[PDB]
Design a binder for this molecule. Structure first.
Ligand SMILES: C[C@]12CC[C@H]3[C@@H](CCC4=CC(=O)CC[C@@]43C)[C@@H]1CC[C@@H]2OC(=O)CCC(=O)O
Ligand SMILES: C[C@]12CC[C@H]3[C@@H](CCC4=CC(=O)CC[C@@]43C)[C@@H]1CC[C@@H]2OC(=O)CCC(=O)O
Length: 115
C-alpha cells in the first residue's frame, strides 16, 4: 500500500467546513500532524496552526481524523515564522499529513465555494 492521503469534501468548501482527512500506507504507529497549507510563493508554503490537529497511524499505516478548513487564515512557515494572511480563494491551498520530520504523502488540493 503506497503512501496516500484523501480529503473529502475537497471542493465547495466554506470557512468552517469540517472535512475528513484520511491516510494510508503511512508509518505504522507514527504521529502525523494534520493541517491546511498554501503556497504563498514559489517553493514556499505556509500553514494554519490555529486549526491543526494530530493523528497516529495504526499498526496498518492507516489514520483518519477531521479538520476545520478556513477560506483565509494567518499563515506560518514550516519553522513557525509568521508569514501573513493567506486567501485560499486565489492561493493554492491543500490539506496534508506530515510527521515530526516533515515526511508524509502528497497533500490534497482544496477549493472553496464561489457563490
Ligand atoms: C517542519 C517540520 C515538519 C512540519 C511540522 C513541524 C512542526 C509543527 C507542524 C504542525 C502542523 O500542524 C503541520 C506540520 C508542521 C509544520 C516540523 C518541525 C520539524 C519538521 O521538519 C523537519 O524535520 C525538517 C526541517 C528541514 O528540512 O529543515
Ligand atoms: C513545508 C514542507 C514542504 C512542503 C510540504 C509540507 C507538508 C505538506 C505538503 C504536501 C504536498 O503535497 C505539497 C508540499 C507540502 C506543502 C512540508 C512540511 C515540512 C516541509 O518543509 C521543510 O521541511 C523545509 C521548508 C521547505 O522544504 O521549503
Amino acid at each position: 500500500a503506497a503512501p496516500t492521503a484523501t480529503v473529502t469534501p475537497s471542493s465547495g468548501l466554506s470557512d468552517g467546513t469540517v472535512v475528513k482527512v484520511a491516510g494510508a500506507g503511512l508509518q505504522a504507529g507514527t504521529a502525523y500532524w494534520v493541517a491546511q497549507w498554501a503556497r504563498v510563493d514559489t517553493g514556499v508554503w505556509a500553514y494554519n496552526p490555529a486549526d491543526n490537529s494530530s493523528v497516529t497511524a495504526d499498526a496498518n499505516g492507516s489514520a483518519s481524523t477531521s479538520l476545520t478548513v478556513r477560506r483565509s487564515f494567518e499563515g506560518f512557515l514550516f519553522d513557525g515564522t509568521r508569514w501573513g494572511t493567506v486567501d485560499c480563494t486565489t492561493a493554492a491551498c491543500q490539506v496534508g499529513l506530515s510527521d515530526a520530520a516533515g515526511n508524509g504523502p502528497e497533500g490534497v488540493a482544496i477549493s472553496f465555494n464561489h457563490h
